[PDB]
Amino acid sequence: GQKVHPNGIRLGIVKPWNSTWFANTKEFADNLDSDFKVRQYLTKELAKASVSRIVIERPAKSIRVTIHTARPGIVIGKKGEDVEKLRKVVADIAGVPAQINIAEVRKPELDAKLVADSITSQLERRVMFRRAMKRAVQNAMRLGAKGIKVEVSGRLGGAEIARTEWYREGRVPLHTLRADIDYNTSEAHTTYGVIGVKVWIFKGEILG
Amino acid sequence: PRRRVIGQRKILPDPKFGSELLAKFVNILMVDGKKSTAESIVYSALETLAQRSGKSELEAFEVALENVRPTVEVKSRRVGGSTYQVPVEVRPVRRNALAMRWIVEAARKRGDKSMALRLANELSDAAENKGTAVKKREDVHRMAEANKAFA
């Protein structure tokens, strides 16, 4: 249990929080329950859409969600249709006048949430695992990445002894606190067990 | 320590006499952190300690400290068969710090009603060359001359 989660040690430094809201100690947990469910249904609904960073920002008795995604073209659907069809079940859970805005994420190969979801859906459909690793390791370096490291963990190929394997290209610092470390994790549910994916992506060092 | 050396930190002189060594007998006498109830047994030591002697208050303690200063001690080299107890010339600071440790030690072990009365029956006799702190200087100086063969 050796490595810290690289996002949490970077939250005051070069990384933002996904939820920027105030409360007192009275209604903090009721907002935290409110924030979890509205991210939970937006995951199940937009699991065919490329949503990466749901941001719950709720100022003064209304909730606002910026959906970070590789495409609005399925997230909007028709122009002003699925932005509104999902809103009426977002104002069900929270209990405030909702506003699901959208900010688009260009360059989908440089996202540790999407690389987690572009390897897992190939592991889900029985590809050779060692090929699927090498697409992500090679595609980021064409798109201008200073370093990548992918890792599949647990019962690879179907055999009975589990193991863990990984690859690396470029440079990924972790002890440097000012490193632009994109990092997330997925879950592969196959017929022999669970496989887990971890991806590190370094962009540069955001100066202070 | 294996690598390096530190020297000493500063030890604050007293309000009473203007001595470095008056702060150094209260520090060996202090137990459990109490400099308040230790510096006052020392102040109630030197009153009856110059009274029987008839000297100055500080100078009577410095003569009782003399008859218990160690001059040869045996340390352990332990490179032969058994432990060799090798006698060494002692540096001038360990002559003093071992002496004050032995005067505090005996005054714990008496049966009088005070601490200052257990103490002043020991710094009186330490200038009079009997007691228990001079038994410790001579039991160290008994082991240091039965090991004079080794160099």
Binding site: G1, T20, W21, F22, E57, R58, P59, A60 | -
Partner: protein, 99 residues
């Protein structure tokens, strides 16, 4: 006098709101008393990081809360009501008062 408190978790977004709330009534009013800081609560925590049995392996967390003060001594007719229509950023609850 008119009190305005600000409680905020971020330490620069509350500094970003005080050159927002002064600049609404500095034009309309005068003798604004000023951006007075107050001390900071540091609400700390401790949990366990193992799922079953490791009592010495822990993470210490905290949540810090930031306080300022904006004091308007006497309003004009056009001081508070221009300040009234405004709404500040996220992560802040303002507390306007009189008394």
């Amino acid at each position: 006098r008119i009190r305005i408190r600000l409680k905020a978790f971020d330490h620069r977004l509350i500094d970003q709101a005080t050159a927002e709330i002064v600049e609404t009534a500095k034009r309309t009013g005068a003798q604004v008393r000023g951006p007075i800081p107050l001390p900071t609560r540091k609400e700390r925590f401790t949990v366990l990081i193992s799922p079953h049995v490791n009592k010495d392996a822990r993470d210490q967390y905290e949540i810090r809360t930031h306080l300022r003060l904006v004091d308007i001594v006497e309003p004009t007719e056009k001081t508070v009501d221009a300040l009234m229509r405004l709404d500040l950023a996220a992560g802040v609850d303002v507390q306007i008062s009189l008394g």
